[PDB]
């Protein structure tokens, strides 16, 4: 695999979003991976609906949190609508998929990266954007403005994001806190430290969609 990956340069990443106060990071994280795999497989970059996952993933808990895996399983077992058809409201409502016509995209499965394994995560990122989790509660992460982030941070993961690239010393993360946070919405998190958890627990739980 190459020394640098940046899915933005391949036209596989949509603009940075802001989840607001709702605990919907799990849905935002999943959607980034769907937008990516559909571009990689079909050549078209579209925005898909975080709100639909928020409303319809019965294994998750709406704005009280949820699971990227379950959201990705939903897209594989049913599908997902375009964001324009099912726009983001920042609050959980009833599932409205059947009212909104046929699904726009559908995947074929979900896979988990072997946890606590930097190289396995880099391999997956080289193939497509990946849903990852980290500890975002610390003030250092909250206040991040730029550079390769080394912490301080623990490994008590609490926030799902998406890995969209890497380089020799970092993994490139698309966050869902708007374009005014970090590097225009992104953070580069240090890698190669030899801590199996990853910086901020980044290697704890990583999933990606499969599409034939
Ligand atoms: C992430 C965010 O910042 O929006 C969000 O808090 C999240 O989904 N976190 C997530 C998580 O904690 N998932 C489980 C939620 C369980 C709620 C239980 C409610 C019922 C209690 N009786 C994980 C993935 C990131 C860490």
Swiss-Prot record:
EC id: 3.4.22.2
Q: Which residues form a coiled coil?
A: none
**Source taxon at top rank:** Eukaryota
Please state how the activity of this protein depends on pH. Optimum pH is 4.
In the record, what terms sit under GO molecular function?
Answer: cysteine-type peptidase activity; serpin family protein binding
Family affiliation: Belongs to the peptidase C1 family.
Tell me the classification of the organism that encodes this protein.
Answer: Eukaryota, Viridiplantae, Streptophyta, Embryophyta, Tracheophyta
Binding positions for leupeptin per the UniProt entry: 25
Sorted keywords for this record are: Allergen, Disulfide bond, Hydrolase, Protease, Signal, Thiol protease, Zymogen
Query: What's the source species for this entry?
Result: Carica papaya
Instruction: State what inhibits or activates this protein.
Output: Repressed by the active-site-directed cysteine protease inhibitor E64 (L-trans-epoxysuccinyl-leucylamide-(4-guanido)-butane) produced by Aspergillus japonicus. Inhibited by the inhibitor of cysteine proteases from Trypanosoma brucei (TbICP, rhodesain) and Colocasia esculenta cv. Kaohsiung no. 1 (CeCPI, tarocystatin). Repressed by leupeptin, a peptidic cysteine, serine and threonine protease inhibitor.
Per the record, what are the reactions this protein catalyses?
A: Hydrolysis of proteins with broad specificity for peptide bonds, but preference for an amino acid bearing a large hydrophobic side chain at the P2 position. Does not accept Val in P1'
Function summary: Cysteine proteinase with a high level of diversity in substrate specificity, an amino acid bearing a large hydrophobic side chain at the P2 position is preferred.
Query: What is this protein's name?
Result: Papain
Q: Please give the UniProt note on temperature dependence for this protein.
A: Optimum temperature is 50 degrees Celsius. Unstable upon 65 degrees Celsius.
Q: Which residues of the full protein are shown?
A: 134 to 345 of 345
UniProt binding sites for E64: 25
UniProt keyword Hydrolase present: yes
Q: What residues form the membrane-spanning segments?
A: none
Which cysteine pairs are covalently linked by disulfides here? 22-63, 56-95, 153-200
Q: Where is the active site?
A: 25, 159, 175
Gene Ontology biological process terms in this record: proteolysis
